[PDB]
Point group: D2
C-alpha cells in the first residue's frame, strides 16, 4: 500500500523563482538547509533579501495587469491549470514525499499517505471552485439594478511555516489562484526545498509568468519586506503568535493591506467518563504526538474526567513508551526528529520547566538518539492550569494530562487560554457532545475524533490563534474583493 | 395567560374576496359551515365555482402586469406590508383564535398560543426575506457578463386544508407575497371563516387590489377550476394524498403549470431503551393526539424497543385516559371534536378495522359526546406492520404502538412505506441518533422532540408525502422563476 | 485544431446497458438507426420496453441501497469519476466527433470544436460541484439545533432528444451523478449510438454497476414506461410539448415523482436601429441556422426595426445563399441535413404553408439534394404574427423576418406566445438593453450575441417551454431531496 | 411635505450610557459641542477617558456571557428588538432630525427625508437578517458529519464619525446586533447628541443591559482606549487614513482583535460624451455638494471627454453658482455650514493651494457668511492630475473638474489615487458602461447615478479606503465567528 522511497534524492531547485525563471539573490548571500535526522547539510539555498522581494512583486504586479493573460483567462481554465498542477504532483508523489521527509523529518509513510494526499485533495477541491464563487444580483430600492463582483484582491504575500511545508503551500495557493490572484511566497528557511520544486511544476502546469513567485530567505528580512511592501495588496501569515504581532504592525505601518493570521494553540482534548476508553486513548495520543507534535492544533491539554483518570493515564503511558522513534524513511518509524536545532533545545527546555514546576514525568523526558533532533515521547500527569507547560505551545512530543470534576468546570478551564484554534470532546452522550460543542471557544471542535480535516471543512482560530479561515468555501473570502455596480434603469419591476 | 374568549364571536366576512372588494357568487349560492362541538350551523358562505375563480384569476393577472403597483413596488416594501399584516393579526388575535376554534374545533388555548403565534412568526420571518433573495453573477467562459434574476412565478393558485386553517394560509401567503407573486386561494369548506377575516386585514394592511383573492367553495368545483386554469402559472395544494394526484394531472392536462404538494403521512416515532422514559411518553402522546390527531405529520406509528414496551404502554394508556375531551372554549379541555361527520365516520371505521385485524384495544375506541363529533382517545397495542392501521393515515386520536428489538430492524420497518413526511427518534446516545437521523427517509427528523417547526426550518415530504419544501429559504424556491441575462462585453477581466 | 474522421467507424456498442454490461431485449426485437446524409441503415439497435426498463430500475435501485458502494463513496470521489470520464471522452473525442456527425448529421467541424468541447466543459464543471452543494445550519427558535442535508432524490429516469445527443446526455448525467443519484436513461431512436459508446467509457472510468443505465428504443413504450414506473423517483424529459404534458400526467397518476421538463420554443431575436449592422447580421444568421435549425432556442422570429429592415434583410438573404450545404464531413460545409425523413417532410410542408399564406419567400425553397435530407437555407420576409410559420416550431433552416417600429411594440409581440425559452436583443444603447432584458418573458436573454451557453449559466423555460432549470448551481436543485434534522439541545446560545 | 421643525430642540441625554443607565465620567470632566450654523456652544458632554471605556467593556463582557439574556434570545427576537427600535425612532423622527441638523449643519429637509429614511431602512433590513444568516453542512470525506456555526465575534468596539452621525450609528448597530454581538461605541465629540438619544430608545425597546454601550470622548483618548483593550474582540473604525492606521497598530499591540475600516477617498466621477447633459450636470453636482460636501465617497475627479468639456463645464458653473447657502432650518436651504473650525480654515487652506499652481476659480471663492463656519460653493476648472486639489480629500463644498480624451487614457488616470471608495460613469452606451465599471478600481461603481445606497448593497473601499464592506450580506461576515464541528459517525452515506 506504500511504495519505496529514495532516501538520498537529488535537489534540483534552490533559488529565487520569478517570471518562471531562476535567480540568485541580489546580494548573492546564501544559507545551508539541514537534514534533522543526521544534523548534516543538504545543500545551499538562495537567501532572498529586501530587494529580491521588491523584484518578486513587480513580476507579480505585471502578471496582474488588466489585459494580462492571467486577468483575461477563463475562470474554469484557472481550474484546468490547478488540476494540471495536481496531476503532476501525483506523478512525482514519491519524490515529493521523500524530499519533504529529507528536509522536514516526518515519517515517510505519513508524507505519502497524509501530506501529499491532502495536497492532492486540496488543490483538486479549489480547481473545481474556480468557476463557482458567485456574486449577487440585489433588489435595491428605486429604479436601479445592482449587483456585486467578487474580484481578486491582487498581489498576495504568503508567508508559510515549516511543519507542513507542502500542505500549507497548497492551502495558500489553493484559493489565491482559484480566485485569480497572484502570489509572492516566502518559504520557511527550515524547509524551503519541496516548495521551490513545485515552482518548477507550476511552470510546467502552464501558469503565466509571475503568477507565482517564491522567495527563500529569513523572517526579519524577506518576511518583513513583504509585510511592509507598499504595493502588496494582502499578506497571510501562519506561525507563532509572537511573530504574528510584527506582521499586523507592519501591515498597519505600510499601505492598509488586508491581513489574515493562523497562530498557535493550547487546544484542549476533553475526555468524559462515558467515552470509548480505547478509542479515546489512541486518539488523544495521536492528537498530541502527530507530526512530532509540531501541529498548530496539537491537543496539548488532555483534560480527563476523574472517574477514569487513572486507567486513561496508565494506557497513555503504555502507548507512549511503545511509540517507535527512528529513521523517518524506515517503514516502522512512528516518530521522526524535530525540525531544527532551535526546536530541539526549546522542547528540552519546556520538559525542564515541566519538571521544575512539579508536574509528574511519567515516561520519556530525554534525548532519543546520538545523532539528529529526536526527542523521546514524553507524558506529564497531574498537570495544573497554572503551570508553564499548560499555557505555552511546546510544539513537540510532550503530553499534559489534567483531571477535572464537572462539565461546567472543564468548559471554564478549557476556554481559559489566549488561544482557541481547536478543541475536542469525547463522549457517547448526545446532550454532552452538544453542550460542549457549543460552549467551547474554538475555530474547530471535533467530537469523537481529532485532526479530521477535509479540504471542505473550514479551518481557523478564535482569540490570538488568528483571524479568517482556511479550507472550504470560506478560504475564498479573504482572497476576494467585493465591487458593487449600481445602474439606473428605466422602471424596476419585480 | 390567555384572555377570556367570546364563545360566540360574530362573523363579519362570509363572501368571495376579489380585488380588495367583497362579492356574492355569480350564482348567488351559499353553503353552511358547522360548529363540530355542537353540530349546528354558524352561518352561510358564498359558494365560488368556475365563474368566480375565473374572475379572481383575471384580477390577479391584472395585478401582476408589468408596471402595476405590485410589480413596481420595492422589495423592502413588500416586507413592510407583511409586517403590517402581522401586526393587524396580532391586534385582532383574540377574535381570530375564537373564530378558529368555533369553525375548526381545536382548543381555544392552543389556537391562541400555538397556532396564532406561528402565523405571526411565519409572516414576520418572510417579511424579512422579501429583499434578501439574491440572484447570482456567474463567471462564464468567453468575453461575456452573465447573471440571474429571481423573478416571481406569477399567478399562484393555492388550496388549503382544514386542520390548520390560519397557519396554512400564512405558510402559502408568506413566501408567495415576499417574492412578488399574486395569489388565488381556495380555502376548505369546513373552515373558510378565519381566512376571509384575514383577507379583510390584507386590505387594511395596504396590499394592492388583486394581489390576494380568496374563493370559498367546494373542491371538485372551485378547487379543480384553479388547477385547470390556463392563466394560472402555479398550484400549491396541501391535502389528502388522493386529491393531490388529481391536482398534478389537471396541471399536466392544462398549461404545464408548476406544482408543489404537501400530502399526508404515517410518520414513525422511534423510542430506544435508553430514552428518558417520562419525556418520551409525554411527547409521543402529544405527537399523536395533537390537534385531535389531525396532523399530516402525526406520530401515528410509535415503535418502542422491547425492554421498555410494557411500562411505556401502561404510561401511554394512563395519559390517554386522563386526556380531557369537551368544549374547546373551556381551559380544562385538551381535545375538542374532529372537524366534521365525514372524518368522524372515517375514524369510527378505522377503529373497527383495528379490532377486526387483531390489534388490542387498550382504551377508548368509541364516541365521547351525544352532540358534535367527539371521539375518545384510543390506543392500540401489539400493532404489526401488515395491519391496515399501521399502513394508512387515520388522521384521528388513535395511537398505534409497535415493538422492535434492534435499531437496524426498525430502520427498514419505519422506511417501508409510501409516505415519508416526518420522523422522530428518542435516545440519549450520540451514535444512535446520528445513525437513525441519517437512515430514515423523512423530510423532517426530530431528535428527542416532536412537532417542532420553525418559520426558519424547511418542511415537506419524501415519497408520496409530497414534493417541494415549506418554510425557510427553501420555501422561496418554488415561487421564483430564474432568468439568465448574458451580455457580450468588449474584454473580460477577472 | 481539427483531426480527420473514419466515416463509417466501427460500432462496438448497440445494445441495452445495465450493470456495466450489455444485453439484448427480453423480446429479442431490434430496430434500425439511419444515416441522414445517405438514408442507409447504419446498424441494428435493441428495442427495449416495459420489461427491460423494469429490469433497469431494479439495478438502479440496488446500486442506490443504503450502504452500497455508490452511496458510501466520498463526495470528492464522484467528482474524480466525472473528471476521469471527461478525460476518456477527450481520448475518443475524434471517434466521437465523427460518430456524432455521422448519425445526427451536423458538420464534423462544429461537432468537434463546439459539441464535445462543451461536453468536456460540462462534465468538468459538474465534477467540481460534487463535494460543494452544502446544506445549512439554521438558528431556529427555542433550545434546538436545526440543520439540513441535501440528499439525492433516487432513481432518475432521463429521456433525451436527437438534436444534441451527446451534449444532452452530459447535461443530464452531470448533475444527477454529482449529487449521487442513479440514472435510467432512454435515448433517442434516431441518435442512440453516441450515448451507448460513452457508457463504455463510464465502466472504464470506474463507476459502480447499476449507477448509470441506458435503454434505447421507442418512446410510446419504453419512454412512457420510465414515466409511469411505480419506483422511479424522478423523470427529466427534454423534447416536444405534447410529450411533456403526457409525462406530467403519468407522474400524477403514479408515484408522485418530481418532474423537470425542457420543451419547445419560438425564440425572438430583436434588432434595434442602433445595433452593429454586420455583427447583428452574422449573429442573426447563426441564431437560426445553427444545427440546421434544430435548436430549442433557435431565433426563429427575427424582429427588425423599420429604419434598417431593408438593409438587414438583403444582407441576411445574401448571407443565407452564401451558406454552403453539403456532406457534413466536408469543411466547406456550414450546414448538413435534417435528422430524418419525418422532419424532412414536416419542414417542407411548413415552407409551402408559408408561401400559401402570403409570406415573401426571398431565397431558398425546398430540397437541396437528391440523396439525404438536405434543405436550402430559406428566408421569408414581411412575416406576420397570425401566420403559422411565426407561431409553430418548424425546427429547420427557415428564417422569418418581421418589421416593427417601436420598443414597446416588440416587447408585446415577442412575449405574445405560449413559449418562453430564449430571446436576444441587439443594441448599442444601455437603457434599451436593460428595458428589454427586464421585459422579455424568456428563461434566457442574450444581449448583442446569441447561443452563448456554458455549464455555468442556467437554462430553462418560462410558461410552457419548461419547468425547472439545468446547468449551473440551479441544475442540482431538482436532483436533491432536502432533509431537516432538528435536535433538542441543553441550552441554545447564539 | 415635511413635518414642522423645532429650530431649537430640547436636549435630554449628554452622559455615558452603560448597563442601560447614565453616568458622568470618572474625572467628571465635560466638553463643548457647537451649533455650527451660529457657533454658540449648544451644551456640555461628559468627557470620556480610558477608564470609562474599561467600565463599558466589562459591562459588555458580562452581557456577552454564555447563559445571559442576550446570548439565549431567539435570533428572531433580536430582529423583533431592532424593529421595535426602528418604530421608536420613527415616532421621534421629527425631533431627531432637528437635533441632528443642530449639531451637524445639514438641512432639516435632508435630516428628515434622507438621513432618517436611511436609518430606518437599514435597521429594518438588518432585523430581517437576524435569523437568516445560515452556516453550512459539509460533505467531507470519511465517516464524519461536519457543520459550521455562525457565532457572534464578541465585544465590538465601534467608533463612528460626525459627517452622517445617526446613519453611521445605524450601519454599525444593525449588523452587529442582528448577529448577536455586544457594542462599545465612541461617538464623535462634535456630534455626540443624536447618537446618545438613540440609547435611551434602546433601553425602552427592551434590549438587555450592556448589549449596547456608548462613550462620548476624544480621538487621542477614547478612540485608542477602545482600540487597545485586552477584552475587545473586534474594532471597527470609520474616519480618515491617518487616524485609521493607528487603529490597525494598537489592535495588534493589544490582543490581535479583528479590524474593519471605512476611510476617505478621491472618488472619480467620469462624465462621458454620448451621455445626457441635463442629468449628468445635475448628478455630478449632487455627487459632491451633498451634506455640505462632508462625504467620504464624494465625487471630486471629474473626467470629461474633450468633445463636450466646454459645453458641459458651462452649465456646471451656473447650477453651482445658483446653489443656495443659508440657515439649515429654512426649506429652500440646500447647503448648511461646516461642522467645526478645523475643517473651515482647512477647506479655505485647500482652496488657496489650487489656483496657486494653475487652477481657474469659477465662483464662490471663500467665506459665505459673517456668523458661522459657512462656505460659499467654490468650483475649479482646468485641473490637471499632479495638484493638491486633485490629490487630497477636501471634505467640503469644493469641486474639481478635469479633462480627458480616449477611453484607455481615463482608466489609468482614474486608477491613480491612493484611494478608491467609489466611482461613477455617465454614459448612454452599453459598452462604455460595461468597460468602465469592469476596470475602474473602486468599491462601488454607480452608473448614471450617484450616492445610491440601498440598505441591501454592500459598501466599503479598495486598498487604503477600508477592509470589509458595510451593508448587504457582506456586512455580517465581519461580525461573525465561524466554528466548525466535525463528528465521527457510524457509517457515512449520501
Ligand atoms: O495541527 C495541525 C495543523 O496546524 N495543521 C495545518 C494548520 C495550519 C495552520 C492553522 C491550522 C491548521 C494540520 C494539518 C493536518 C494535521 C494536523 C494539523
Ligand atoms: O458620499 C457618501 C458617503 O461617502 N457616505 C458615507 C460613507 C462612509 C465611508 C465610506 C463610504 C461612504 C454617505 C452616506 C450617505 C449619503 C452619501 C454618502
Ligand atoms: Na531543518
Ligand atoms: Na366546521
Ligand atoms: Na439518424
Ligand atoms: Na441653527
Amino acid at each position: 500500500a506504500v511504495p519505496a522511497p529514495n532516501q538520498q534524492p537529488e535537489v534540483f531547485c534552490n533559488q529565487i523563482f520569478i517570471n518562471n525563471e531562476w535567480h540568485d539573490a541580489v546580494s548573492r548571500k546564501t544559507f545551508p538547509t539541514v537534514n534533522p535526522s543526521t544534523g548534516e547539510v543538504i545543500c545551499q539555498v538562495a537567501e532572498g533579501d529586501k530587494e529580491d522581494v521588491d523584484k518578486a512583486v513587480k513580476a507579480a504586479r505585471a502578471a496582474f495587469q488588466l489585459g494580462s493573460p492571467w486577468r483575461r483567462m477563463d475562470a474554469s481554465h484557472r481550474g484546468r491549470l490547478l488540476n494540471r498542477l495536481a496531476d503532476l504532483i501525483e506523478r512525482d508523489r514519491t519524490y515529493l514525499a521523500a524530499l519533504e521527509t529529507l528536509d522536514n523529518g516526518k515519517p515517510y509513510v505519513i508524507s505519502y499517505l497524509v501530506d501529499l494526499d491532502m495536497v492532492l485533495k486540496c488543490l483538486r477541491y479549489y480547481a473545481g471552485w474556480a468557476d463557482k464563487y458567485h456574486g449577487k444580483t440585489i433588489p435595491i430600492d428605486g429604479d436601479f439594478f445592482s449587483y456585486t463582483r467578487h474580484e481578486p484582491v491582487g498581489v498576495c504575500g504568503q508567508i508559510i511555516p515549516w511543519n507542513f511545508p507542502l500542505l500549507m503551500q497548497a492551502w495558500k495557493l489553493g484559493p489565491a489562484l482559484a480566485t485569480g490572484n497572484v502570489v509572492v511566497m516566502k518559504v520557511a528557511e527550515q524547509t524551503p526545498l519541496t516548495a521551490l520544486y513545485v515552482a518548477n511544476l507550476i511552470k510546467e502546469a502552464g501558469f503565466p509568468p509571475g503568477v507565482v513567485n517564491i522567495v527563500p530567505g529569513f523572517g526579519p528580512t524577506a518576511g518583513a519586506a513583504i509585510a511592509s511592501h507598499e504595493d502588496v495588496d494582502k499578506v497571510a501569515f501562519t506561525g507563532s503568535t509572537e511573530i504574528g504581532r510584527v506582521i499586523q504592525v507592519a501591515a498597519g505601518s505600510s499601505n492598509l493591506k488586508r491581513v489574515t493570521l493562523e497562530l498557535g494553540g493550547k487546544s484542549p482534548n476533553i475526555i468524559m467518563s462515558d467515552a470509548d476508553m480505547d478509542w479515546a486513548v489512541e486518539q488523544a495520543h495521536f492528537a498530541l504526538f502527530f507530526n512530532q507534535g509540531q501541529c498548530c492544533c496539537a491537543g496539548s491539554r488532555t483534560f480527563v474526567q476523574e472517574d477514569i483518570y487513572d486507567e486513561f493515564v496508565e494506557r497513555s503511558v503504555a502507548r507512549a513508551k511503545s511509540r517507535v522513534v527512528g529513521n523517518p524513511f524506515d517503514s516502522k518509524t512512528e516518530q521522526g526528529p524535530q525540525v531544527d536545532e532551535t526546536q530541539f533545545k526549546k522542547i528540552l527546555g519546556y520538559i525542564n520547566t515541566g519538571k521544575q514546576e512539579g508536574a509528574k514525568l511519567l515516561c520519556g523526558g530525554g534525548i532519543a538518539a546520538d545523532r539528529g533532533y529526536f526527542i523521546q515521547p514524553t507524558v506529564f500527569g497531574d498537570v495544573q492550569d497554572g503551570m508553564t507547560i499548560a499555557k505555552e505551545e511546546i510544539f513537540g512530543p510532550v503530553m499534559q494530562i489534567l483531571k477535572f470534576k464537572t462539565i461546567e468546570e472543564v468548559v471554564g478551564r478549557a476556554n481559559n487560554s489566549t488561544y482557541g484554534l481547536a478543541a475536542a470532546v469525547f463522549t457517547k452522550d448526545l446532550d454532552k457532545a452538544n453542550y460542549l460543542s457549543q460552549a467551547l471557544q474554538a475555530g474547530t471542535v471535533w467530537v469523537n475524533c481529532y485532526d479530521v480535516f477535509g479540504a471542505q471543512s473550514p479551518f481557523g482560530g478564535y482569540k490570538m490563534s488568528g483571524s479568517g479561515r482556511e479550507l472550504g468555501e470560506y478560504g475564498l473570502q479573504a482572497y476576494t474583493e467585493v465591487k458593487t455596480v449600481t445602474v439606473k434603469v428605466p422602471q424596476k419591476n419585480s
